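pipeline/complex-builder :: batch 7 item 3
reading input block
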Amino acid sequence: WDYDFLQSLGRHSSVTEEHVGLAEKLKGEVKSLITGPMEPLAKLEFIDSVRRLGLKYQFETEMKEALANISKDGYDSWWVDNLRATALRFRLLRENGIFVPQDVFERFQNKETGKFKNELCEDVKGLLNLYEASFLGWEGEDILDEARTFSTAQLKNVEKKISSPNLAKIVHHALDLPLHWRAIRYEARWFIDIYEDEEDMNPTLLKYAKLDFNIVQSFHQAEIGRLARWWVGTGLDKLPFARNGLIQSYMYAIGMLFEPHLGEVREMEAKVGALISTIDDVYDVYGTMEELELFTDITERWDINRVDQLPRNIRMPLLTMFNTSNDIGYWALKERGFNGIPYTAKVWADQLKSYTKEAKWFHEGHKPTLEEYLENALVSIGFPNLLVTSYLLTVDNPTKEKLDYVDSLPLFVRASCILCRIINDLGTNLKSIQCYMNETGASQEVAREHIEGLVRMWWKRLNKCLFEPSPFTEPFLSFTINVVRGSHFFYQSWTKNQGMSVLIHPITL
Amino acid sequence: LWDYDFLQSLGRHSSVTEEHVGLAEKLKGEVKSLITGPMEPLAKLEFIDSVRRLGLKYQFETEMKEALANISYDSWWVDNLRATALRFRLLRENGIFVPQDVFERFQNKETGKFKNEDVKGLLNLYEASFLGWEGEDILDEARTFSTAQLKNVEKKISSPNLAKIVHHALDLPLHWRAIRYEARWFIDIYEDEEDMNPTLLKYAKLDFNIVQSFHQAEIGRLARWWVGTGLDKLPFARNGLIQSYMYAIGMLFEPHLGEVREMEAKVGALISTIDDVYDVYGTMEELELFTDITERWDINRVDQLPRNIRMPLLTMFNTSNDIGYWALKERGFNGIPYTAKVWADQLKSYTKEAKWFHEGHKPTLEEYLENALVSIGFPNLLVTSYLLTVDNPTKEKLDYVDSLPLFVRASCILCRIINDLGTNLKSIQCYMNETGASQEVAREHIEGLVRMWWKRLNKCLFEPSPFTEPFLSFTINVVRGSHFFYQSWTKNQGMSVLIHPITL
Amino acid sequence: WDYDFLQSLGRHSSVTEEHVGLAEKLKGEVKSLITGPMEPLAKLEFIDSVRRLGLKYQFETEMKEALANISGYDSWWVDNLRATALRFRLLRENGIFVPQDVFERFQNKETGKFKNELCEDVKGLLNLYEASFLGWEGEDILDEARTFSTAQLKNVEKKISSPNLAKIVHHALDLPLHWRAIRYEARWFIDIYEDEEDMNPTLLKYAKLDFNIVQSFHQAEIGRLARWWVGTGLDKLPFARNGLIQSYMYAIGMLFEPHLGEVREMEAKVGALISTIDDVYDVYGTMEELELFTDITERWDINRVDQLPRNIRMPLLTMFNTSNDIGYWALKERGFNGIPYTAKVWADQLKSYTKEAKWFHEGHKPTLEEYLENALVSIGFPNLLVTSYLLTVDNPTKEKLDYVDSLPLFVRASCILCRIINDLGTNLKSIQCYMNETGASQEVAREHIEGLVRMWWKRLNKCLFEPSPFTEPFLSFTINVVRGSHFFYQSWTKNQGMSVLIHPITL
Amino acid sequence: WDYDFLQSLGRHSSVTEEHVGLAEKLKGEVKSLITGPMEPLAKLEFIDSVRRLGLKYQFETEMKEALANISKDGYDSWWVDNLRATALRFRLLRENGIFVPQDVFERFQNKETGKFKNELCEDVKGLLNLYEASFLGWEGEDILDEARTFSTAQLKNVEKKISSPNLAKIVHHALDLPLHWRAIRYEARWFIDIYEDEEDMNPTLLKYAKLDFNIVQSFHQAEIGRLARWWVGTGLDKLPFARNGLIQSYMYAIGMLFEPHLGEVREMEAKVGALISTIDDVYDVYGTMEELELFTDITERWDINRVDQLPRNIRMPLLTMFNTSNDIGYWALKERGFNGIPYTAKVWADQLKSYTKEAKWFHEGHKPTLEEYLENALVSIGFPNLLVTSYLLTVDNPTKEKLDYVDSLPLFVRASCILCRIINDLGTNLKSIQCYMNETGASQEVAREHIEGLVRMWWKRLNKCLFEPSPFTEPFLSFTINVVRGSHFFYQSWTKNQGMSVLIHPITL
Ligand SMILES: [Mg+2]
Ligand SMILES: [Mg+2]
Ligand SMILES: [Mg+2]
Ligand SMILES: [Mg+2]
């Protein structure tokens, strides 16, 4: 699984014109099912299955219309009495922009205690739906927070009592990471196999999911091949800091966006990620403070007059970053009619400045507070760069004002960047947990709990931001949520198996 | 103004012209440039406040929010109270919290009293204090201090424009003043300010004339609707439609909400007629039938109520069904159950009050207000406004709004106490019976309740909520409208706001 | 940071009898390593590591004997400056004189400047820089080595690839080892030694264990002092928030050894009183009240204390009671009543305060020498050092106490250093007084004061080699108070507090 | 070759203060060239020329820095495809402690056969670099062994086909002995004249090499004068044994160490060598078994009570040896702070014991196996004595443990001692060759090849030992390799000519 193999990818695709034709036929049939009459709860379950299979992109309009009709109903008898239905309706409506109040769950609470009634401690699907629905909550929605802790504890208790292996796998999967926090492409790969074993499974939807996944995978294989050839062309692959960073970066980009129509944007994002990995090793280990300061100054000024001062192992990544930023800016000028080079140069400069600040603290024995560390670390995570670039390459009618606003890191973008940083720190000198430990003296386990609380808080803010008015539109909103999901999935070897399963091996038909 | 024949004629001949619209959009672009353009921060705050007072905030909301965000170094404002109070008020008004401790510097820690000639400074402090919440004692003290000082300095002012402004603030703070009426008054006041921006003044005059033309068309349609219903021929509520429409203008004036405003005016007109029917015209047997028919939404027996009562009940029934259908057609959600339910609840509240009056009951203030908040008719008006404006309406949301949660309840209670203050047994009398206190002390107690409920409404605005615009503005604006309407004089306000254009 | 918390300290100790046993076993092993044969440069480096880790108190005689034997087979170090400098610094630090001419061979005869080749060895530059602070006045070769090594280390700091070495270089540039407080530097060095390539695991483990054991003693001391402070009731006074914890940290800088816990606590008590009284004279007190406070202290007669208000009388009585208790402790343990000396030194300190207040109330602007002659007394170190001498000197007598109270050159240098160090770290102070005396700019004046710091240190270094009536541990107290001042005046004290006093080192 | 002349040497030196000043000026210029930018192949060739001229001691640090930078240049295009560059880089890097794998030569091998391709048996310098590089190989590196045999056969074939006399001389010299096995001082003298006639010669380096040679020669002349006076002082000059033996020992010692700063150690080594020659003759010819047994027992006990039992001709060498060993131990005590008398006495005891064992085998008609003969002969050659003494007089902070370890026969020292013994036996009743002949009955020619194979094997072990971790450091490492080189040089009259050329006659300027 080296570069010679990756460059080869995309030459021979398993999919055939017959497979694509059957896929478009099944797509029409699935569209008919989605818009066709169905019992409301059944429709909600089907729509959820379509989303879980990674097919929401194909039927986005039909799904939204169907949910809207199911929402504006003067008859709530079908769902109000049982929690499983109430939770499924609450989650799907919120996920598609239709607000459902938390008060919908008061009936299931003890008025005196305020805790959820134990009568649902027995139904696994009821607990699973409540648990998933609790992650769509906003700040101050204490009913949802109680549902979260209740369902989490109950699912942990009932996990061992489950007899059906498929259900046990589903429950363990949800406990590990809720659907709301799971990367769409990877979850789609897992769900195809899980959905196959469900008793109430729809063969047409399952077949379409397998065919569409294989067809999209062929696009991904071609992109892996082009990116691998690009990386070898740059020569960063022969550097120590590259390692398997290029393929890892592509996997992260797959988590951010997997749709075929965004292949060019995805390739550019993967390039930025690969550069991030190589420069990360250069600043963290290889570079000397004098060399790194020169690297940062060169980036801030966009002047390569002294690159020749730096040694080859440092100069080559700096020039590759410079050339890539210039190419991405030119691509933006050619396709979107807006020169993006000033923004790409600025975001790389800001990222390098953040690295310089951390290196200076590491060299001066400073120990920052959690808020001080995070203010720099949200920038240093590299996502501000990734999100701004994604906005520049996808926004409709780009302008200096719009790019400047996104570059300002408003609350919606800031929440995502902070989440990526804290999630990364959670998975593994001084990180969020250690900074908090020094700030409060608390034990490592309690500090980790505090950081986890921050994770939940930032997700609540992201969820509310999706409902607030915003200048952003699709697909930037999805990029912002998906980078967080990709981080959750990637920071819980095993990455080689996920790479082969999602990108290399097709699903057998 | 009080002739249906005259009102129906309106909308046929509009004073505005395409040239006026073009000049309006040119000035609008210039004002946007000024609002987002560089300016000294205190100057920017003053300009943004002036755009609001001219009733132009709807046109430049995002720009203003940004400029205020940028305004939120801090040396220019921390030292001086005039600047501190203006920044505090504007920031709180736009969702940026500013603590009351910002006024700690301008008060002796040694003495719990704001120290003692800036009239504008006192005005800014007074207005900012009404943006205060419960428990913000610094703001409350600043309020009482500024009120006493402004009353004291009112007589020492030589400049008539400033004297009018001070007297106006003493009459009603900006926070409690109806936006459209205040905008009309401020246009003339702003004209006389030395540091006035001519472009902003022109845009304010032009935009007012255009909106007024929209209101004239709405008045014509509503007048024709009223004569079509025939309630105009009945004896009660002489000239109630125009009154109801004026109240609705206070609630919402923006043109894009004309259909919602017309429907709100229709409900108001029905309130005016049915209120007279229950308090004076109807007999207890007739009222009980009217209430039962509304609660069950079955008109089988309407033919038992005499014509003078049957016609209002049927107009109410048809109007509620029409509003519900309009909701079904435009928002894809049948609102007839909610319009019927809120009218049933309102009639039930009337029946309960009539029974208390018929049984010599004297309720406690809390007992009276729990029913009176419903009887004022604002739960009906606010729920209808929510049904007609919320994005993606649902049964859950309508049920929640209909439950009268704290945000809605505060507005309803405020409107009831405000009406009673302006004007059987009311809030003041009920308190007098509950504590035996004198009328003057009781009125002060009610005024304190008004301030308390305003603090709560203000607090609700910064907490997370299911509600968003424009419902949040409907809730605050109905209270402002009540303050304005319950301080003849309505004919002069009618001609000035609805009929006569501002001369150019 | 909370008095309830500090009083709570000492209730639950992390250390266990097994940990103590393992500590004494490792101690024996470290003793064996310190006295056993080893290559000379390696031995010097090991001894230096022992000193930086704060273990010198445990292994002091073996270190002195080893250096004595090392002081005739001396060829191993003459060739390289790094070894020469390490030998010079450690020998001077341990009382074995080494002449400055030992570095002339590495200097250019014509120019008199050091050869640029030593710029290649980072370790070489570090040893030269540290060795330059052990110099006396007139040792110009050492002074040149100082300026040279400082400039070279600044130049090579950015060129270092090893992060641990880079951290060490930046730390030395911030403050040389000679000027760093032993306990705080020991805490910092423990972590660095783990990441040093040439680390001894037994010594490292012992350093971690011994630090934790000493920390338990400090926690108990903090608890005792916190209960004492609340008992006095000065905690509820508006003045001197967290004065007690800052004073205890300062005492830790002055002396950290466990056997001196009682003396350290008394020093901390004096410090806490100083913190409270400073606010009373500088801010809270009226001229009439302060003049009365000073007269009461001079007479050691409290008949008129009730004239003062409660907020000012309380600190005066607590100071009076504390001084009487410290004097009694001296009488009971050392068989010599120290109350006259504690009363006299408290009198001389507040009179100082009165003299400064007189300058402040009459708009006087003193010359630097005039200001410092009073300010050395006002900093409070004469009081702290005299009390420390009274509580530690062997067979105390009136003559010995009078001599120390006279502020001879060795004590005076430390007092002046502490006052100027405080002024350097923080309306006329030492710097401003110089600015008025010479009209020079603030930037030039700061350099002049820094020069004074180096000069006074040179005098202290020479005094350590001159014959003196003073012996240990007073000599260490005198040097350590200046080191404590350098460390404390470079918030951040909370970060040093948690690391040194509250949280144990994980094993 | 007369003691009066040797004692006379050192009185009048040809060098002048001007010559030294010019030497230090040229030294700075050569140092500048060594650290200055240069073409990579040119730099490798220049460093090789500096080493061949015997100037490595002067620029040891600059050479190490230059080679260190050359190993991580990353740009490998200049050497990866050229055999000459690949071999030169491999040899120089290994010689300076930078490991280079044998696989670097696979590209130049025929994949099917595994033999080297004939395509490069035309270029003489290419073959020369390959041949020299092959002697830096370790055991199990069959590629290097093949390179050795291939290049040797090809160089023999093209030697007669070479037209350029300088190239023909270089090829003939390499065939006689590779650079790796050549004594540094003697090779430096030989190379100076050849380098002058090489087309790509650096005049500054040539001049510095000639000047430094003259200065070092003056130091050696002074050493010869002192040693000659010491020898006449001992009075073993007039004894029948070891005629003209002292100077030979000094010449041999020059091969072991030639640097002027080690003159004192070199003089002591020369003294030991002279004593070895005289006592060797005493045991082999002059002494009776009774006298030799007494000599060995007296040496072993280090008790001279019975010296008067021995005749004057034997007592004088024994006493001179006793006084010299005691003096060397005292010198160690004075300069290194460690009394070395027990070690000098012990190594002389071991050497005499080895002589006694061989004489006993000779008197009992024993025929040892090759391993049996070598086990004693490695001690009898006298290199264990010379190496232990050299370690005692130069190691930093000597200790009983280090001296005991060196006195032991660990792999690094033992390999060198065995090599010196087998090389000496190869050059000249039963020795290594005859012992093998008796052990296997094999013919003399096959036996000589087997011993040569042992020489190659032990050299491979020495090369690996230099790369293995060791307690030993410089200059002991150099002494251990150089004693082997000195043996190769001394055993294929001609030594008188080499003496005059290296020690007496200066290079004309
Ligand atoms: Mg980094
Ligand atoms: Mg009524
Ligand atoms: Mg003071
Ligand atoms: Mg022999």
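note: Chain C is about 70% helix and 0% strand.
queue -> next item
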